[PDB]
Design a protein around this ligand. Structure first.
Ligand code: ATP
Ligand code: ATP
Lengths: 291, 291
């Protein structure tokens, strides 16, 4: 029984489920009332659910250490009898991001500038632990060169999965041509490692009366522009978010061309997750980059 | 635009959102206070939103006609400018199902027995109209044989979608073998059509002070055992629910094997809805049935 396990693991006499079931695609979310305070619990039954949640915990702690963004405090990861795991975190009363969008834009810009301007400086792209893009674990092996890191551990990792799962000849051939072209989009620019949320789409951000809230991160040190790809692609972010952000971090030359590259990664990732519906966007984006 | 459209279609001067729900994975749900009374509104912007909501309306009315379960009254389906539709229904003050679990078990058993012992004469499996499992429309063409109906219009329909979107050969190979096994799983039993809620997972049931409440159905006449499958797999039902249910409808021979078969449909349905993470549960269940 989940409720009995939750009572034992959280050492609480009271456990009352409140609200409607969480609108999660990855996991099932339920909010519980506890003596210490309200909590939110995500349940995933896959075998490696603990690894995925531990990467999410590591991401939340890295974001919390900056003190620049409001994210739920992770509390406990519990191995579930019968496989899988549960992830307990602080419950946050949340509403859709609108009035606090401009505040979030400033916080995200500060987050991306945090590493280069701090006391101890991460001079490589990657992460100390594995984080998951959706259900797919990602290699975060440290790399000195961002185009190298993005091509190997993001684009190639996704395209290898596509070849294994779908053996799509068109993706194989287009990647062969586009792979050599990637350095052209980054020449003459200084790329600094920046701590990223990792999946900053509208579904992973919210607000309360104090301000904006972000959650469900898959963090790593990367190009700050990659973070915006999620945000622009799937909509849901007010214009003031991007306006406030780019006042502190203006669009570097070649922003729109790199945006195609970063949108490509998410199309491939959605192809591996959801199937042939994302084949045409993935291939079309590669063709536009080669045109 | 929605609030102004809602005021016009409901002919209410006042429309005050309470509870700040934002609830639902398939659709966006919000509770509004109106001159006539409080209402709950589900919004879906996909092209087939009207068909999906109309199947829900037909399902709610079929359950309400029995008088055996308390279900929200459907009110209006509104076509939205810009695509999609809104579904307005009676608002119900609801809390998570706990004390009323055993009561729901008796009501669900009575609901399933209504066709057999009531003035109901449906001697075939199916439904008079299309109902949707999530976003997926389902064929409910009447069939004399339940294993034929379930294999053709439920299992095969989902696997056809998986084949188109993922071209999963392992799913194809296991399904071809499971097709031969399906008639053996029914032990020569005569299956009686039973009116089903259709999606009785814990997130679709609740309670008030009067008793249990169920909602969001995708109804059809099928095997009564199929109803419990979703209820078991994703948890949330107290043990007293199943105890009260099976006091009125004991487990027929082969219950545990058919449960795997009915849980397979929900894993496939979650694969088509949420993606490849549900491939391993779907394939593992098929392998377990073939062992
Ligand atoms: N700490 C929290 N407190 C309250 N509600 C939360 C909390 N974390 C998440 N939620 C709710 O649960 C929903 C889903 O959360 P989350 O994005 O972490 O789930 P997921 O299934 O892991 O991911 P995804 O939905 O992005 O595929 C959020 O949109 C929000 O409504
Ligand atoms: N008639 C109602 N009155 C009040 N609240 C309701 C009503 N119907 C639904 N709700 C609330 O909205 C939540 C979601 O409702 P529902 O399950 O119908 O949404 P859906 O998005 O179509 O489906 P799902 O969440 O299963 O994917 C419920 O858990 C409940 O909290």
């Amino acid at each position: 029984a989940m409720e009995q396990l939750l009572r034992a693991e959280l050492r609480t006499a009271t456990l009352r489920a409140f609200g409607g079931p969480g609108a999660g695609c990855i996991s099932e979310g339920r909010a519980y009332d506890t003596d210490a305070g309200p909590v939110f619990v995500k349940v995933n039954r896959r075998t490696q659910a603990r690894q995925m949640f531990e990467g999410e915990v590591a991401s939340l702690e890295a974001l919390r250490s900056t003190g620049l963004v409001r994210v739920p405090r992770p509390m406990k990861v519990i191995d579930l009898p019968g496989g899988g795991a549960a992830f307990v975190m602080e419950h946050l009363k949340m509403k859709s991001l609108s009035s606090q969008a401009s505040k979030l834009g400033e916080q995200m810009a500060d987050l991306h500038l945090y590493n280069q301007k701090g006391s101890s400086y991460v001079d490589k792209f990657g992460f100390h632990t594995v984080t998951c893009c959706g259900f797919i674990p990602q290699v975060n092996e440290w790399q000195d060169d961002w185009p190298t890191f993005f091509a190997r551990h993001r684009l190639q990792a996704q395209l290898d999965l596509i070849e294994k799962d779908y053996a799509d000849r068109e993706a194989r051939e287009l990647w062969s041509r586009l792979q050599v072209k990637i350095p052209d989009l980054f020449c003459g620019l200084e790329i600094v490692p920046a701590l990223l949320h990792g999946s900053l789409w509208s579904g992973n951000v919210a607000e309360d009366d104090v301000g904006p809230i972000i959650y469900d991160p898959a963090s790593f040190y990367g190009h700050s522009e990659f973070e915006l790809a999620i945000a622009l692609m799937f909509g849901g972010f007010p214009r003031s978010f991007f306006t406030a952000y780019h006042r502190k971090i203006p669009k570097a030359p070649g922003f729109d061309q790199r945006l195609l590259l970063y949108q490509l990664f998410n199309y491939l990732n959605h192809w591996n997750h959801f199937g042939r519906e994302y084949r045409s966007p993935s291939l079309g984006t590669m063709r536009r980059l080669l045109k």
